[PDB]
Structure 1
Amino acid sequence: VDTCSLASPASVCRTKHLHLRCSVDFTRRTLTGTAALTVQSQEDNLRSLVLDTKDLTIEKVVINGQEVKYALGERQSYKGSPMEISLPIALSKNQEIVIEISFETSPKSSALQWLTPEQTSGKEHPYLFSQCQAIHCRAILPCQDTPSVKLTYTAEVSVPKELVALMSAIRDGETPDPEDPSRKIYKFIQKVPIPCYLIALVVGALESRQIGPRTLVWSEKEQVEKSAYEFSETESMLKIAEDLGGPYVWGQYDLLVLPPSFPYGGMENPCLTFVTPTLLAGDKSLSNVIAHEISHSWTGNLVTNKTWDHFWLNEGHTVYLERHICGRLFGEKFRHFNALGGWGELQNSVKTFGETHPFTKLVVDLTDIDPDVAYSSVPYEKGFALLFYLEQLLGGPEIFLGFLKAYVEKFSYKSITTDDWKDFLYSYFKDKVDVLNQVDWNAWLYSPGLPPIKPNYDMTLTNACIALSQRWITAKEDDLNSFNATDLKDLSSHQLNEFLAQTLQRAPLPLGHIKRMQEVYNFNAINNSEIRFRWLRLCIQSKWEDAIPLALKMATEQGRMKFTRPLFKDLAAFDKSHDQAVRTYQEHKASMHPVTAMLVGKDLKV
């Protein structure tokens, strides 16, 4: 059972297909049209069914060419309002019908951000983007908003003719709109059954440039050249992923580089990955995020978590594949470096939440919990740590990669639970059951806190990071002079980042140390978002007032929650910036992403 959804479950009825016909109204900030759901009964004598909705206005529901009865239940907070539809004729098991629903979205749709021209790069046109994961599809259209159901889709999207629509689907042509010549209709087909959280739409002044045999990069014209360079490893990564995961089944792999308020590093929307412009470091150094989104083309999009309680399946295996891709490109030592960095991030999350907190369990119980509130690094890094531990228990990366490929093959086009995964692990490694039985399953899967066992990590790339961090931590005032720019000479951007991560784990440091750090290392000059993020957190937590306008600027000039949330929290926790932090949030709140605005609000207790 999916406790995040109010719809009839998959055991009752299944959506097989969505035909979406809609128009994007920028003057009203509404999407208006029809969602025609092809629904298959899983039961005898089915006479009603329920769909998820959230902030939707329903005009009518048509089945067999006539309007039918429906009712909207009371809103259940973040879950939205259940919509019960009265079938005109009782259905037998496996019978299919088409239910056509006329709806309009609200300007406040938690799935959508509507941007004014001023919020864009070009300053001439408005822009719209969606983000359905986890349970925001119901805020665009009535559906069974649960990843336990997979459907294909087709769509026709009418937009102002000077703008471009793109979806998580194959582009299927464009024509002028016969109902309004100031508009174009863009068409889309997704022939691979997907969970509805992977439905995606962007509308904006978009341009494209090809960067590989199956990849266009899309963005506003101002960002096209930089993006094309930043993401040029994309085809190489696809070829590696295909080798590890089996065939890429989605046809194209395009990239869309969003405006700065996109709330995540990326979103694995099929055919069209969405990414933050905060990846544009200029040197490809944040490309692990592309590797990660590419990996979702197998783990997540082919094999899918049945409910959000099992989100680690999606994320753990994806981080696992992600790190293999980068290990193939840059070496096994770098894979170990990133793996160990991940353990560090998990230490951070568990410390932040508290070692007994329910959100530090690998498998979580989301009953009455908003998934956006529960979201963290835990499913990513605790999930990865389990897989990395298993890899080491079961004979190493070659062997475990054989399991991963078989697992993808076994569960493609399906939605699964942790028990499904574990059953298959035991099946695949049947001659190593003795070794599998040594695993503390109850702790790994169901207990809060750090895992019961830490994997073995190569230290080669990490040692210099730890060494330098420890010099700074143990330094007294008379040691500060010995620091110099040459300390960084042999460190990659990755290692600088890990140096800062190490030091941040011990923050605050004395203000004089941090001032010295800026003096000799000039971290203020670094535009790498990951590095700049940790550096500003270190400065604010160490009470450097000079850093306040810098942290405020970063927190607001982009909206990636990974960065915006902790910067606002740090600013709020520093007495000198507290008031300005709260004021800045209040002033920006209406023009922020609705999920981000909600969460920063909660973080700031505002």
Structure 2
Amino acid sequence: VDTCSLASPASVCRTKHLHLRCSVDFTRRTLTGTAALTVQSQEDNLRSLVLDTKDLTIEKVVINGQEVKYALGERQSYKGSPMEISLPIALSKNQEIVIEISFETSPKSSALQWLTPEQTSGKEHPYLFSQCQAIHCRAILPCQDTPSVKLTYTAEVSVPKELVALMSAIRDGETPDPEDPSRKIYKFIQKVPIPCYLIALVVGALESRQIGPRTLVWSEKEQVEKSAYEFSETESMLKIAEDLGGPYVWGQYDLLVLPPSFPYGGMENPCLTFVTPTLLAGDKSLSNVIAHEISHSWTGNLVTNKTWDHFWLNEGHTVYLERHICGRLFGEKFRHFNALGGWGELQNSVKTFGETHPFTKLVVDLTDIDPDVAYSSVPYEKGFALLFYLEQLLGGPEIFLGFLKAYVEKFSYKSITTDDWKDFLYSYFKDKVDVLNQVDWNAWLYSPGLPPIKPNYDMTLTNACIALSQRWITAKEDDLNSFNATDLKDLSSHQLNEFLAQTLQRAPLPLGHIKRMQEVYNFNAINNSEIRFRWLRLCIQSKWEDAIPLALKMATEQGRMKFTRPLFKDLAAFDKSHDQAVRTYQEHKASMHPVTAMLVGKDLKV
């Protein structure tokens, strides 16, 4: 059972389909309409069921054409309020009925960010986007808000006629709205069963450009050309992913480039991946995020974690596939470079939480924990590290990719636990059980801290990064003259980033060192978001007051939490910028994404 959901579990009843009919009201910042849930009883004599809700106003519940009794329980913090519905006729096992709930969202919906025209590229029209993962779908519509249940869906969405609606589904046409000529209705169909966290909606002044046989990129007009170029490797990556994972079942693979406040690098919404505009580096160098989102089309969207305690199944396997895609495109030495960088990020995460912290376990226990507070690189990188270690134990990448494909095929359209995964690993590799039994399963799956063993990494591309980082760390004042722009001449953007990551792991450095780094490398000029993030962190941690306005600007001009949270935290930790950091958060809080505002507030103790 799912300790993050208040709804009836899958063992009691299962939602098979959602038909959503709604209207997006920008004047009120509300979504209003009806959610018709087709529900299948899993029990004899079923007379009631419970759904998740969060800050929803319920008008009525209709079954068999008549209003029925319901009750909203008390709010249980971030979990929201349970909604018990009294069924008019007792159901037999496997009987299906349709329950139509009339509802309206709150402007404060934690699933939604409502943007004013000023907050968009075009400055004329407003914009709305959703982000349900993990447990925010209940803040859009009443549902069994657990990934243990998979449903198909159809939707009709009425929007102001100058705007476009898109969803995690196949577009099924548009018409003027008969109830309001100032509006358009956009229709959508998702015929593959999905967990509700994958329900997504965007409304805005959107344009599209074709970039491959099954891919359009969508954004505001101002970003279309740059996005088409940035993500032009998409089809090549989809082809490799199909080779590794099996058939792509979702029809199209479109991309949507969101406004800068989108809180994450990407979200693998089926048919329509959402990405941060912080990927728009100009040189395709941050395309691994696209590889990651593509990979979720198998690991996550087809094979799904049964509860959020098992989130590493989604992420570890996706990072594993991501790094294989990038290895195929750019070589095995590059895969190792990225794998080793990932271990570095895991080191950082473990150090941040502390080596005994429960959020550093691979399988977590989210009982009475807000999923958004637990979120970190751990499931990604500790999960990847386990799979990479197993690859090395079991005879290499060709062999292990055989397992991955078989795993996806075995559990397609299902929701599974860590034990399901482990049982299948043992089944697939039955002739290697002696090797499998050498793994310290209790440590890897259930213990906090760094894994009990570190995999073997090729160091070829990393060596120059470490060498230069070490030169800086061990430099004394009289060595600073020796550094020069030529030091960087043979380093790729990825290597510059890794040099900064290595150096940040030892921060602070002396202020004069950091001043010299700017003098000779001109890192202030680099617009690549990953590099700029790490550089500004290094500058702030090393107490360079000149970097304060730069870091405040980056923290607020975009909202990807990977960057915004640590920049604010670093600015708060620096005495010279502390008061400004707090004031800046206070001033921006009302117009921030609701989850980002919550987490930055928590980080700052404000």
Q: Same fold (TM over 0.5)?
A: yes
Shift of 1:362: 0.1
- What's the counterpart of residue 512 of structure 1? 512
Shift of 1:265: 0.2
Deviation digits for residues 524-576 of structure 1 (CA, Å, limit 9, x no counterpart): 00000000000000000000000000000000000000000000000000000
Shift of 1:126: 0.1
Shift of 1:584: 0.1
Deviation digits for residues 187-206 of structure 1 (CA, Å, limit 9, x no counterpart): 00000000000000000000
Shift of 1:253: 0.1
- Specify the SS of the correspondent of 2:237: helix
Cα distance between partner residues in 1 of 2:321 and 2:137:
27
Matched residue count: 606
Shift of 1:381: 0.1
Cα distance between partner residues in 2 of 1:173 and 1:16:
23
Cα distance between partner residues in 1 of 2:259 and 2:137:
21
Shift of 1:5: 0.2
- Specify the SS of the correspondent of 1:261: coil
Shift of 1:121: 0.1
Cα distance between partner residues in 2 of 1:4 and 1:605:
25
- Specify the SS of the correspondent of 2:365: coil
Shift of 1:17: 0.1
Deviation digits for residues 459-518 of structure 1 (CA, Å, limit 9, x no counterpart): 000000000000000000000000000000000000000000000000000000000000
Cα distance between partner residues in 2 of 1:235 and 1:105:
37
Deviation digits for residues 261-320 of structure 1 (CA, Å, limit 9, x no counterpart): 000000000000000000000000000000000000000000000000000000000000
Cα distance between partner residues in 2 of 1:40 and 1:316:
32
Deviation digits for residues 362-419 of structure 1 (CA, Å, limit 9, x no counterpart): 0000000000000000000000000000000000000000000000000000000000
Deviation digits for residues 97-149 of structure 1 (CA, Å, limit 9, x no counterpart): 00000000000000000000000000000000000000000000000000000
Cα distance between partner residues in 2 of 1:560 and 1:317:
23
- Specify the SS of the correspondent of 2:548: helix
- What's the counterpart of residue 536 of structure 1? 536
Deviation digits for residues 62-99 of structure 1 (CA, Å, limit 9, x no counterpart): 00000000000000000000000000000000000000
* Amino-acid identity (%): 100
- Specify the SS of the correspondent of 2:431: helix
Shift of 1:228: 0.1
Shift of 1:429: 0.2
Cα distance between partner residues in 2 of 1:329 and 1:605:
44
Shift of 1:54: 0.1
**Where do 1:245-394 residues align within 5 Å?**
245-394=245-394
What is the TM-score with the length of structure 1 in the denominator? 1.00
Shift of 1:350: 0.2
**Where do 1:59-78 residues align within 5 Å?**
59-78=59-78
Shift of 1:259: 0.1
- Specify the SS of the correspondent of 2:8: coil
Deviation digits for residues 414-442 of structure 1 (CA, Å, limit 9, x no counterpart): 00000000000000000000000000000
Segments of structure 1 that go 5 or more residues without pairing to the other structure are none
Shift of 1:221: 0.1
Cα distance between partner residues in 2 of 1:425 and 1:375:
26
Shift of 1:236: 0.1
Cα distance between partner residues in 2 of 1:563 and 1:86:
46
Asked whether 1:400 is paired with 2:400, we answer yes
Cα distance between partner residues in 1 of 2:220 and 2:523:
29
Cα distance between partner residues in 2 of 1:257 and 1:183:
24
- Specify the SS of the correspondent of 2:156: strand
Shift of 1:583: 0.1
Deviation digits for residues 192-232 of structure 1 (CA, Å, limit 9, x no counterpart): 00000000000000000000000000000000000000000
Shift of 1:602: 0.1
Deviation digits for residues 337-356 of structure 1 (CA, Å, limit 9, x no counterpart): 00000000000000000000
Cα distance between partner residues in 2 of 1:222 and 1:148:
40
Cα distance between partner residues in 2 of 1:221 and 1:309:
40
Segments of structure 2 that go 5 or more residues without pairing to the other structure are none
- Specify the SS of the correspondent of 2:43: coil
- What's the counterpart of residue 468 of structure 1? 468
Asked whether 1:583 is paired with 2:583, we answer yes
Cα distance between partner residues in 2 of 1:320 and 1:602:
32
Shift of 1:44: 0.1
- Backbone CA RMSD of aligned residues: 0.1
Deviation digits for residues 142-181 of structure 1 (CA, Å, limit 9, x no counterpart): 0000000000000000000000000000000000000000
- Specify the SS of the correspondent of 2:576: coil
- Specify the SS of the correspondent of 1:49: strand
- Specify the SS of the correspondent of 1:190: strand
Shift of 1:34: 0.1
Cα distance between partner residues in 2 of 1:67 and 1:76:
26
Q: Which consecutive segments of 4 or more residues in structure 1 shift more than 2 A?
A: none
- Specify the SS of the correspondent of 2:94: coil
Cα distance between partner residues in 2 of 1:89 and 1:542:
68
- Specify the SS of the correspondent of 1:577: helix
Cα distance between partner residues in 2 of 1:468 and 1:386:
30
Cα distance between partner residues in 2 of 1:193 and 1:311:
19
- Specify the SS of the correspondent of 1:363: coil
- Specify the SS of the correspondent of 1:576: helix
- Specify the SS of the correspondent of 1:497: helix
Cα distance between partner residues in 2 of 1:135 and 1:464:
43
Cα distance between partner residues in 1 of 2:320 and 2:80:
34
Deviation digits for residues 226-273 of structure 1 (CA, Å, limit 9, x no counterpart): 000000000000000000000000000000000000000000000000
- Specify the SS of the correspondent of 2:23: strand
- Specify the SS of the correspondent of 1:239: helix
Cα distance between partner residues in 1 of 2:212 and 2:313:
30
Shift of 1:25: 0.0
Cα distance between partner residues in 2 of 1:492 and 1:6:
49
Cα distance between partner residues in 1 of 2:172 and 2:453:
50
Cα distance between partner residues in 2 of 1:319 and 1:163:
35
- What's the counterpart of residue 120 of structure 1? 120
**Where do 1:405-484 residues align within 5 Å?**
405-484=405-484
Cα distance between partner residues in 2 of 1:45 and 1:450:
49
Cα distance between partner residues in 2 of 1:175 and 1:504:
54
Cα distance between partner residues in 2 of 1:104 and 1:567:
36
Deviation digits for residues 1-33 of structure 1 (CA, Å, limit 9, x no counterpart): 100000000000000000000000000000000
